């Protein structure tokens, strides 16, 4: 019955993917950001300049106050609110209703986005990183406890404004081609994985693989960019600069500030390298790779100038908190969060990114010795 969940995601480019949900009795409809990089379910519950609607607890007969406060600081944004529970449904999801923890957001700073069309956030990661602490059961845990929905979901994020599918409780085979390749979830807090090798246009970065996972590597639909640890970021930029040296860019471009433009249709895709991330596989000394095209890490931005050219932002960012495989990485892949078997699967998406002479890929098996040494402790 997964067909009902196909294409249940929408969004604006760079503003996040959201799914429709209802909370409370009678049902109040809200668009909820899909975020595998956090674990709190929270909704606007008070007026805000950027909210068109919000959760009204007084109007719901099934609402319960937990009489406790909560706040959540993300990378830049944060909100605080009051904890409670209420009945929750996903119209284009499984036909069930669950009583879930809900943070009613009463104050926020740089959290809600003007024009994003979502009013809440669904943290899909594990209780370990839930606020105020891991005793606050995350939504998906509640879903799995209270219903017969299997303990897994899959995300097909399609580029561009944007659309996609969140298949709750299973895998929909019409959404990907080729084989699914699985990498272990290293620890159940973030969806943490281990990167064991990195190549750019087929050339190994040849760093200590611990550098790739310092201090962690995670899959995060709630973050746009590929974010890389400082040392890896520098090596990667150096290699990508070298490959594209035929053209010149502002150095603020490599920092993600200045967008670069070309005459509509003349974007020199060919001079930007493919990036291959090798992930630890399911059997001994085995890994597989996903290959990212420049169309994924050069994100299209509307030109502020009167010219309708093709302008792009460099969507690879330096991190101090580990590798983040963000939405631009997940796009064009079908990603299976198989919580039941503690693994994440990757396959080429049906809505894969197009290049003239190149193709995003998930390929294996590869042999990689000493993969356990790649994990940072
Ligand atoms: C370049 O970095 C800036 C940046 C860009 C983006 C998102 C975040 C940060 C963002 O903060 N993302 C968090 C996710 O939950 C973040 N997930 C992580 C995180 C980081 C700090 C603290 C927590 C805890 C709440 C567990 C989790 C693991 C990285 C979710 C989020 C919160 C608020 C607005 C959002 C998304 O907008 C969606 C569209 C913008 C996507 N780009």
From Swiss-Prot:
Induction: Up-regulated by the Ca(2+)-regulated transcription factor NFATC4. It is found in: Cell membrane; Golgi apparatus, trans-Golgi network; Endoplasmic reticulum; Endosome. The keyword Disulfide bond applies. It is a single-pass type I membrane protein. Its EC number is 3.4.23.46. GO terms for biological process: amyloid fibril formation; amyloid precursor protein catabolic process; amyloid-beta formation; amyloid-beta metabolic process; cellular response to amyloid-beta; cellular response to copper ion; cellular response to manganese ion; detection of mechanical stimulus involved in sensory perception of pain. It catalyses: Broad endopeptidase specificity. Cleaves Glu-Val-Asn-Leu-|-Asp-Ala-Glu-Phe in the Swedish variant of Alzheimer's amyloid precursor protein. The modification N6-acetyllysine is found at residues 68, 206, 210, 216, 230-231, 238. Disulfide bonds join 158-351, 209-374, 261-311. GO terms for molecular function: amyloid-beta binding; aspartic-type endopeptidase activity; beta-aspartyl-peptidase activity; endopeptidase activity; enzyme binding; peptidase activity; protein serine/threonine kinase binding. N-Glycosylated. Addition of a bisecting N-acetylglucosamine by MGAT3 blocks lysosomal targeting, further degradation and is required for maintaining stability under stress conditions. Acetylated in the endoplasmic reticulum at Lys-68, Lys-206, Lys-210, Lys-216, Lys-230, Lys-231 and Lys-238. Acetylation by NAT8 and NAT8B is transient and deacetylation probably occurs in the Golgi. Acetylation regulates the maturation, the transport to the plasma membrane, the stability and the expression of the protein. Residues 38-377 are extracellular. Residues 38-347 form the Peptidase A1 domain. Keywords: Acetylation, Aspartyl protease, Cell membrane, Cell projection, Cytoplasmic vesicle, Disulfide bond, Endoplasmic reticulum, Endosome, Glycoprotein, Golgi apparatus, Hydrolase, Isopeptide bond, Lipoprotein, Lysosome, Membrane, Palmitate, Phosphoprotein, Protease, Signal, Transmembrane, Transmembrane helix, Ubl conjugation, Zymogen. It comes from the Eukaryota. GO terms for cellular component: axon; cell surface; dendrite; early endosome; endoplasmic reticulum lumen; endosome; endosome membrane; Golgi apparatus. Inhibited by RTN3 and RTN4. Belongs to the peptidase A1 family. Monomer. Interacts with RTN1; RTN2; RTN3 and RTN4; the interaction leads to inhibition of amyloid precursor protein processing. Interacts with SNX6. Interacts with PCSK9. Interacts with NAT8 and NAT8B. Interacts with BIN1. Interacts (via extracellular domain) with ADAM10 (via extracellular domain). Interacts with SORL1; this interaction may affect binding with APP and hence reduce APP cleavage. Interacts with NRDC AND NRG1. Responsible for the proteolytic processing of the amyloid precursor protein (APP). Cleaves at the N-terminus of the A-beta peptide sequence, between residues 671 and 672 of APP, leads to the generation and extracellular release of beta-cleaved soluble APP, and a corresponding cell-associated C-terminal fragment which is later released by gamma-secretase. Cleaves CHL1. This is Beta-secretase 1. It comes from Homo sapiens. The gene is BACE1.
């Amino acid at each position: 019955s997964f067909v009902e969940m196909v294409d249940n995601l929408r969004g604006k480019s760079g503003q996040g993917y959201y799914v429709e949900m209802t909370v409370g009795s009678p049902p109040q409809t809200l668009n909820i950001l899909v975020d595998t990089g956090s674990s709190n379910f929270a909704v606007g519950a008070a007026p805000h300049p950027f909210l068109h609607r919000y959760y009204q607890r007084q109007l719901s007969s099934t609402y319960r106050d937990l009489r406790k406060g909560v706040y959540v600081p993300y990378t830049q944004g944060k909100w605080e609110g009051e904890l409670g529970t209420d009945l929750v449904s996903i119209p284009h999801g499984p036909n069930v209703t669950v009583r879930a923890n809900i943070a009613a957001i009463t104050e926020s700073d740089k959290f809600f986005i003007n024009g994003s069309n979502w009013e809440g956030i669904l943290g899909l990661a594990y209780a370990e990183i839930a606020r105020p602490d891991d005793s606050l059961e995350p939504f998906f845990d509640s879903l799995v406890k209270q219903t017969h929905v299997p303990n897994l979901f899959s995300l097909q994020l399609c580029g561009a404004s944007v659309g996609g599918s969140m298949i709750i409780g299973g895998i929909d085979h019409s959404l990907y081609t080729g084989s699914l390749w699985y990498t272990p979830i290293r620890r159940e807090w973030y969806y943490e994985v281990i990167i064991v090798r990195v190549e750019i246009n087929g050339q190994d970065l040849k760093m200590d693989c611990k550098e790739y996972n310092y201090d962690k590597s995670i899959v995060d639909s709630g973050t746009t960019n590929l974010r890389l640890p400082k040392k890896v970021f520098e090596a990667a930029v150096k290699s990508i600069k070298a490959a594209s040296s035929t053209e010149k860019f502002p150095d603020g471009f490599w920092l993600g500030e200045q967008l670069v433009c070309w005459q509509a249709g003349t974007t020199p895709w060919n001079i930007f390298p493919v990036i291959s991330l090798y992930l630890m596989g399911e059997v001994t000394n085995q890994s597989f790779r996903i290959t990212i095209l420049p169309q994924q890490y050069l994100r299209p931005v509307e030109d502020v100038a009167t010219s309708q050219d093709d302008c792009y932002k460099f969507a690879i960012s330096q991190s101090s908190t580990g590798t983040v495989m963000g939405a631009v990485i997940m796009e064009g892949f079908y990603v299976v969060f198989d919580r039941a078997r503690k693994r994440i699967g990757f396959a080429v998406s049906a809505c894969h990114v197009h290049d003239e002479f190149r193709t995003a890929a998930v390929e294996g098996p590869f042999v990689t010795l000493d993969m356990e040494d790649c994990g940072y402790n």
